[PDB]
Enzyme design. Structure first.
Site, mmCIF file in Angstrom:
data_model
loop_
_atom_site.group_PDB
_atom_site.id
_atom_site.type_symbol
_atom_site.label_atom_id
_atom_site.label_comp_id
_atom_site.label_asym_id
_atom_site.label_seq_id
_atom_site.Cartn_x
_atom_site.Cartn_y
_atom_site.Cartn_z
ATOM 1 N N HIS A 1 21.742 -17.205 24.716
ATOM 2 C CA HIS A 1 20.795 -18.259 25.143
ATOM 3 C C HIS A 1 20.526 -18.035 26.621
ATOM 4 O O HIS A 1 21.183 -17.151 27.238
ATOM 5 C CB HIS A 1 21.292 -19.677 24.801
ATOM 6 C CG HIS A 1 22.601 -20.021 25.449
ATOM 7 N ND1 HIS A 1 23.782 -20.237 24.804
ATOM 8 C CD2 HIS A 1 22.858 -20.281 26.753
ATOM 9 C CE1 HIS A 1 24.734 -20.534 25.661
ATOM 10 N NE2 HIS A 1 24.223 -20.592 26.885
ATOM 11 N N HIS B 1 17.340 -28.986 24.284
ATOM 12 C CA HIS B 1 17.517 -28.706 25.709
ATOM 13 C C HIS B 1 17.405 -27.200 25.943
ATOM 14 O O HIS B 1 17.254 -26.768 27.098
ATOM 15 C CB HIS B 1 18.885 -29.227 26.277
ATOM 16 C CG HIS B 1 20.063 -28.652 25.524
ATOM 17 N ND1 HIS B 1 20.696 -27.490 25.880
ATOM 18 C CD2 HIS B 1 20.603 -29.050 24.336
ATOM 19 C CE1 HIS B 1 21.599 -27.222 24.956
ATOM 20 N NE2 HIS B 1 21.595 -28.155 24.019
ATOM 21 N N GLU C 1 22.324 -20.267 36.923
ATOM 22 C CA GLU C 1 23.442 -21.240 37.029
ATOM 23 C C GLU C 1 24.386 -20.748 38.114
ATOM 24 O O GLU C 1 24.639 -21.488 39.077
ATOM 25 C CB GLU C 1 24.119 -21.481 35.701
ATOM 26 C CG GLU C 1 23.193 -22.075 34.636
ATOM 27 C CD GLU C 1 23.777 -23.021 33.654
ATOM 28 O OE1 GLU C 1 24.579 -22.440 32.890
ATOM 29 O OE2 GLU C 1 23.493 -24.210 33.579
ATOM 30 N N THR D 1 28.715 -24.709 30.499
ATOM 31 C CA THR D 1 27.914 -25.305 31.583
ATOM 32 C C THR D 1 27.169 -26.546 31.116
ATOM 33 O O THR D 1 26.388 -27.124 31.862
ATOM 34 C CB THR D 1 27.014 -24.257 32.309
ATOM 35 O OG1 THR D 1 26.022 -23.788 31.344
ATOM 36 C CG2 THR D 1 27.852 -23.084 32.891
ATOM 37 N N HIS E 1 19.119 -20.028 30.509
ATOM 38 C CA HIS E 1 19.067 -21.102 31.466
ATOM 39 C C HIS E 1 17.941 -20.688 32.459
ATOM 40 O O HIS E 1 17.890 -19.493 32.807
ATOM 41 C CB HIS E 1 20.303 -21.468 32.301
ATOM 42 C CG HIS E 1 21.411 -21.946 31.407
ATOM 43 N ND1 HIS E 1 21.727 -23.229 31.154
ATOM 44 C CD2 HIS E 1 22.248 -21.181 30.667
ATOM 45 C CE1 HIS E 1 22.763 -23.283 30.298
ATOM 46 N NE2 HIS E 1 23.062 -22.054 29.974
ATOM 47 N N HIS F 1 23.163 -15.763 28.807
ATOM 48 C CA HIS F 1 24.576 -15.998 28.440
ATOM 49 C C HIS F 1 24.776 -15.417 27.039
ATOM 50 O O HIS F 1 24.005 -15.840 26.168
ATOM 51 C CB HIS F 1 24.960 -17.491 28.424
ATOM 52 C CG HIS F 1 25.031 -18.128 29.815
ATOM 53 N ND1 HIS F 1 25.174 -19.504 30.002
ATOM 54 C CD2 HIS F 1 25.044 -17.590 31.028
ATOM 55 C CE1 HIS F 1 25.244 -19.739 31.292
ATOM 56 N NE2 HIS F 1 25.148 -18.644 31.952
HETATM 57 CL CL LIG Z 1 27.321 -22.159 28.253
HETATM 58 HG HG LIG Z 2 25.065 -21.393 28.847
#
Ligand SMILES: [Cl-]
Ligand SMILES: [Hg+2]
Ligand SMILES: [Cl-]
Ligand SMILES: [Hg+2]
Ligand SMILES: [Hg+2]
Ligand SMILES: [S]
Length: 256
Positions: free
Chosen positions: A90, A60, A102, A195, A92, A115
């Site tokens: 990482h 993912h 996010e 998250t 998003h 993050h």
């Molecule tokens: Cl996270």
């Molecule tokens: Hg994250």
């Protein structure tokens, strides 16, 4: 669980009832409602590039892991009393270049988000243990705005060729993720969660006041990694951002 219509965010509660908890992340930061807290110190990050270890495709997403054996790379200051050990970074992103972060600010969604996660080594003996505790993790969140290409992301973009499909990993060394943060030392902080599943409510968030850039072509590269294992049919890593969750009475504090 994933981000598809079938096993996505709006379905996570069937499986992880904490998904509907009281300290779920991400949240919308309303700048007219934040609270200035004069006790907040400047954050101090001190990372050792020799702690960089590997890059891995988790399906993912992709994670960049660091050896977290000692305290060579830590975060101090801000709202904390203890030092948090660097364990990973990482990203998003969304299906479009304009809306994939996010956290949102004043209702506005950014293009992407970085993050940088750390665990409380001062109270816990391992990350496994600390992950489910209220004070277990500290994550720095940096909002990404599509515009000019960011040359500091290069080494990461270049590594991606080696972990195209799920389960692939490669050495990723001599890197200091502090190179990715904005110059600003100002932030917002609030108590929340991971998250994505397991969605543990063990995170103290540090959201930078300043955003970093990224071009649409750098974002397309994240979007090109595959979620499938090698040999199977191609399924791209189209998106991995969770919708904002109700604040349910938490206070977002500002260092300014
Ligand atoms: Cl996270
Ligand atoms: Hg994250
Ligand atoms: Cl900061
Ligand atoms: Hg999306
Ligand atoms: Hg920051
Ligand atoms: S920041």
């Amino acid at each position: 669980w994933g981000y598809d219509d079938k096993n996505g965010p709006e379905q996570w509660s069937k499986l992880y009832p904490i998904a509907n908890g009281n300290n779920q992340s991400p949240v919308d930061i309303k700048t007219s409602e934040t609270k200035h807290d004069t006790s907040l110190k400047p954050i101090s990050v001190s990372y050792n590039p020799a702690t960089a270890k590997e890059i891995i495709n988790v399906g993912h997403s992709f994670h960049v892991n660091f050896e977290d054996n000692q305290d060579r790379s830590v975060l101090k200051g801000g709202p904390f009393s203890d030092s948090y050990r660097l364990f990973q970074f990482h990203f998003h992103w969304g299906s479009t270049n304009e809306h994939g972060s996010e956290h949102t600010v004043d209702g506005v969604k950014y293009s992407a988000e970085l993050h940088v996660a750390h665990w409380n080594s001062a109270k816990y003996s391992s990350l496994a243990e600390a992950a489910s505790k209220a004070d277990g993790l500290a994550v720095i969140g940096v909002l990404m705005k599509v515009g000019e290409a960011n040359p500091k992301l290069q080494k990461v973009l270049d590594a991606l060729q080696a972990i195209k499909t799920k389960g692939k990993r490669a050495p990723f060394t001599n890197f200091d993720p502090s190179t990715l943060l904005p110059s600003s030392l100002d932030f917002w902080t609030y108590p929340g969660s991971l998250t994505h599943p397991p969605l543990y409510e063990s995170v103290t968030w540090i959201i930078c006041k300043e955003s970093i850039s990224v071009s649409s072509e750098q974002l397309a590269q994240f979007r090109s990694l595959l979620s499938n294992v090698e040999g199977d049919n191609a399924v791209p890593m189209q998106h991995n951002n969770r919708p904002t969750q109700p604040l349910k009475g938490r206070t977002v504090r500002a260092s300014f």
